[PDB]
Design a protein around this ligand. Structure first.
Ligand SMILES: NC(=O)c1ccc[n+]([C@@H]2O[C@H](COP(=O)([O-])OP(=O)(O)OC[C@H]3O[C@@H](n4cnc5c(N)ncnc54)[C@H](OP(=O)(O)O)[C@@H]3O)[C@@H](O)[C@H]2O)c1
Ligand SMILES: CC(=C\c1ccccc1)/C=C1/SC(=S)N(CC(=O)O)C1=O
Length: 316
């Protein structure tokens, strides 16, 4: 199990990264510092997580301390939905770069295929509780993303939460300059993404699996919800390998040739989560974990189910 995957832009991406959604600003600096110390070289960020400045502080201080150099880090951020307009993309990227205190990003993703009404609300909703869209489409936004590469602000561009038809649309875009390097999607044993993964990988697009632990700190969590980390079938596989359930859920996508980005602000867990290069899940382990699929999403973007570009009506 090698530590990095080759992207279609020629760059190598670490298969294990640190997630930062829900990581409070006052805690994420320490989280990122510990992460770097124990070997993470990939941090997944987003303007919408509203902690990019404090992530930036951690990176800047580890660079200053000569712990790591910039070339050795792989920093990922994402274009928020209110910025899909071609004229707004560069600005939003520069804001993220400014917050992160970086010259460039290694990877910049379109966060969701759905464009929102531009303005100061992250989620402009109307009286029906539905999002107020922007008159934007994925192809023009992609052209704008491409320009960021040409200008050297980002080394790679990609997408997130795109279904295979949406990916195909970009791949077939008239005048396409750069194929998406990565499609970051929710993936774990309750949402295995077999067809979407097979499609992306057949196209040379690397898949990053998010919420691999099932996002137990998700705002909407209810006691009746399924729980990956407490699934006795999964705990059993974990016990057999003498690893924690989390380490199993992290190793699972790695063996599918996926990048995985578990989130923690807990120093002990950050270290524990990285300790997954010292064991293997058996072939049957993988088959069994795959059999647990139930099409269950943590992130269903429910306020946007009428958006023309809502990604989760399609089968995959
Ligand atoms: N592109 C997208 O639309 C999208 C959507 C969702 C997420 N993401 C990205 O993917 C990242 C990870 O997904 P996520 O944050 O939804 O959830 P996750 O990584 O599946 O789960 C994180 C939660 O699990 C806990 N945890 C972490 N390590 C643990 C361990 N070893 N044992 C027990 N509990 C543990 C964390 O607690 P503590 O933090 O308290 O330790 C936190 O509550 C996000 O941070 C974000 O970077 C992207
Ligand atoms: C309300 C803001 C949300 S909903 C949601 S799922 N996420 C994760 C993501 O999009 O990466 C958010 O940041």
């Amino acid at each position: 199990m090698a530590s990095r995957l080759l992207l279609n832009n020629g760059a190598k991406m670490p298969i294990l990264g640190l997630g930062t959604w829900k990581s409070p600003p006052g805690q994420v600096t320490e989280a990122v510092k510990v992460a770097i110390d124990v070997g993470y070289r990939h941090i997944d960020c987003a303007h919408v997580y509203q902690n990019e400045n404090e992530v930036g502080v951690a990176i800047q201080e580890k660079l200053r301390e000569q712990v790591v150099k910039r070339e050795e880090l792989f920093i990922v951020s994402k274009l928020w939905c209110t910025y899909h307009e071609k004229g707004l993309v560069k600005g939003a990227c520069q804001k993220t770069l400014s917050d992160l205190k970086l010259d460039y990003l290694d990877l910049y993703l379109i966060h969701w295929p759905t464009g929102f009404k531009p303005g100061k609300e992250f989620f402009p909703l109307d009286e029906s509780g539905n999002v107020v869209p922007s008159d934007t489409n994925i192809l023009d936004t992609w052209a704008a993303m491409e320009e960021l590469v040409d200008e050297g602000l980002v080394k790679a561009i990609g997408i997130s939460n795109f279904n295979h038809l949406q990916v195909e649309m970009i791949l077939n875009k008239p005048g396409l300059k750069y194929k998406p390097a990565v499609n970051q999607i929710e993936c774990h044993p309750y949402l295995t993404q077999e067809k979407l993964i097979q499609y992306c990988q057949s196209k040379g697009i690397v898949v990053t699996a998010y919420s691999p632990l099932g996002s137990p700190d998700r705002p909407w969590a209810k006691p009746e919800d399924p729980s990956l980390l407490e699934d006795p079938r999964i705990k059993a596989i974990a016990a057999k390998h003498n690893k924690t359930t989390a380490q199993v859920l992290i190793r699972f996508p790695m063996q599918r040739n996926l990048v995985v980005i578990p989130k923690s602000v807990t120093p002990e867990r950050i270290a524990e989560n990285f300790k997954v290069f010292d064991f293997e899940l058996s072939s049957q382990d993988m088959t069994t974990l795959l059999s647990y699929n139930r099409n269950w999403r943590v992130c269903a973007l429910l306020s946007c189910t009428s958006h023309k570009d809502y990604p989760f009506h399609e089968e995959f």
